[model samples]
Target: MNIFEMLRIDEGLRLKIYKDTEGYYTIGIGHLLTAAKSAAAELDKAIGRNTNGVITKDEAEKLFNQDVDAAVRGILRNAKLKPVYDSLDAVRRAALINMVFQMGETGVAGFTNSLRMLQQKRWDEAAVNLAKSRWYNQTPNRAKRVITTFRTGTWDAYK
Candidate 1:
């Protein structure tokens, strides 16, 4: 499956603005509405409509596409991650992009040892290192799935 399909199943779509687990205002497949000054204003801009507190499925899919595009670009732009990211297969690359999608580039950059292990092709070690992070603790199921994908270089975990 593609990264879009993977994230679609994982994040789920939300037409209405709602609070994420961390209480951040979010909408349209985990897009952060509070990142802008006004949540409603941000939502309005994304869907190119007044929004009226909700969006169309088409709008949500468009936002999700943009978010995943940014996530892929973020990994490619990182100095340390770019080269290592280039070395990985699509399945492993999606795991990294998924991490960057859930967190940001800055957040994923914190996993120094994990990234190093991944670069070295030490799949099990990389998975273990990522498992130790607060990100893993905060989102156990998602983290486990991503880590397993990274370890196995397969899409089975995502399924």
Candidate 2:
């Protein structure tokens, strides 16, 4: 299957812009328009993106691709990923990147101990730490699946 399809299943496809459970302006399969994790400076907004909160599938995919690349690169650059990022299998890398995409680099940066555990190859502890967050409280199902993958080292999730 295509990567977009994979992300769509995990993120849930949405055609219209709407407030997410966290009340951020969001659209098109879990893309958050206003990322709270962004501090210090505003992220340069994409041109042609409507301020009125509407989106097309093509537009959505564009932003998704951009965000996914940034997110994965964020993971790669972080000390947590370290030497391990290059060595990880596709599924494992993708799963972590999804976490980065779901929560911005700043948000994922909050998982300090969890990342430490991950670097240590302490998968169970990593999963446990991943679950021990307000993010998990807000999105238990997604968290559960991600946590499960953390344990099982599989790419399994609902489509």
Candidate 3:
């Protein structure tokens, strides 16, 4: 599956605001609304309504794409990650982007040993390092799938 499709299934779509697993206010395609300067403004834009909490499918699609862009750019902009990123194949690259999309670049950056493993082309080690995180404890299924993708350099078989 492509990155978009992977994220759509992994994150799941929501028309209205709901608390995420972490209890943070979030909206369409895992978009965090908790820290938004103006949740009303964002909701209004996405829903195309005065301030309703729901968004149209088209708006959700647009928002998802924007999130992917930010994730990709965030990875590219990181001096430590950029070169390692450039060397990866498409599947591995998508896995990295997926991690960044799920938890912002800063969060991913905390995986120092994992990133080093990736840099050295040690896919198994990298996946193992990532699977050892609190992130894995919080979402074992998603983390397993992502780590598998990274380790095997392929999309999940079920997809």
Ranking by lDDT: 1, 3, 2
Between prediction 1 and prediction 2, which has the larger TM-score?
1
RMSD of each: 1.6, 4.4, 2.2
lDDT of each: 0.86, 0.69, 0.84
Error of 3 at 134 (Å): 0.6
Which residue runs does candidate 2 get wrong by more than 4 Å?
1-3, 35-52
lDDT of 3 by residue, 75-142 (tens): 99998778778989998898889889999889988888998899899987888888889999999999
- Per-candidate TM-score against the hidden true structure: 0.94, 0.79, 0.91
Distance from true position, residue 155, model 3, in Å? 1.1
Candidate 2: worst 10 consecutive residues by lDDT?
35-44
lDDT of 3 at 105: 89
Question: Which candidate, 1 or 2, would have the higher lDDT against the true structure?
Answer: 1
Minimal lDDT window, size 10, model 1: 32-41
Task: Report the number of the highest-lDDT candidate.
Answer: 1
Candidate 1: residue 159 Cα off by (Å): 2.2
